[PDB]
Design a protein around this ligand. Structure first.
Ligand SMILES: O=S(=O)(O)c1cc2c(O)c(c1)Cc1cc(S(=O)(=O)O)cc(c1O)Cc1cc(S(=O)(=O)O)cc(c1O)Cc1cc(S(=O)(=O)O)cc(c1O)C2
Ligand SMILES: O=S(=O)(O)c1cc2c(O)c(c1)Cc1cc(S(=O)(=O)O)cc(c1O)Cc1cc(S(=O)(=O)O)cc(c1O)Cc1cc(S(=O)(=O)O)cc(c1O)C2
Length: 129
């Protein structure tokens, strides 16, 4: 499923992402956009054998288990297919763990190139809140 902007911001807020470890809500919305275009089914392969999964493009090298990334860890203790679900709960919970561990959000490449140090609030303006 593809979220709209405001629908995603809203769900992210309900999951307590707003200002989580210092990152205002537009940050998580912005990162979702440039990682997956708001698509819960997004997946992308990496050259090391790992795959990024879901709305926040969470990597199987470190964070989840997809049974085909040899020698990988599963630090969120979660199957990667759970990161592909229509309900974003697992993605959110895994995203919290990544950030709190942590490298903040700098871990997300697209967030670092398109969101960090810009007007991330534009991503939430005009939404019901
Ligand atoms: O997209 S919207 O923010 O406009 C929206 C508002 C409400 C909605 O019921 C829905 C969307 C439909 C809907 C969407 C989703 S999601 O897109 O997958 O996030 C989930 C649900 C849902 O009804 C189920 C649901 C989950 C939660 S959560 O455990 O906190 O994530 C809370 C609620 C849910 O219905 C209650 C709820 C809260 C809120 S509020 O944003 O907290 O005011 C609005 C609406 C609600 O139904 C009222
Ligand atoms: O990822 S975080 O947003 O939590 C973060 C915040 C600060 C940080 O200092 C860093 C990360 C570490 C860091 C990372 C990087 S990068 O991974 O290569 O993108 C670069 C730097 C850095 O300190 C160096 C740096 C770059 C820039 S830029 O011109 O915008 O690219 C600005 C700064 C830097 O220190 C200053 C700065 C800005 C910001 S702001 O969020 O843009 O206001 C937060 C922090 C800053 O130190 C305070």
């Amino acid at each position: 499923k593809v979220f709209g902007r405001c629908e995603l911001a809203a769900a992210m807020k309900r999951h307590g992402l707003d200002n989580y470890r210092g990152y205002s809500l537009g940050n998580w919305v912005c990162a979702a956009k440039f990682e997956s275009n708001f698509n819960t089914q997004a997946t992308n392969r990496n050259t090391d054998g790992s795959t990024d999964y879901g709305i926040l493009q969470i990597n199987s090298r470190w964070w989840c288990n997809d049974g085909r990334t040899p020698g990988s860890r599963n630090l969120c203790n979660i199957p990667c297919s759970a990161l592909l679900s229509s309900d974003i709960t697992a993605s959110v919970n895994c995203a919290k763990k990544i950030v709190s561990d942590g490298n903040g959000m700098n871990a997300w490449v697209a967030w670092r190139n398109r969101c960090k140090g810009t007007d991330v609030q534009a991503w939430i303006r005009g939404c019901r809140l």
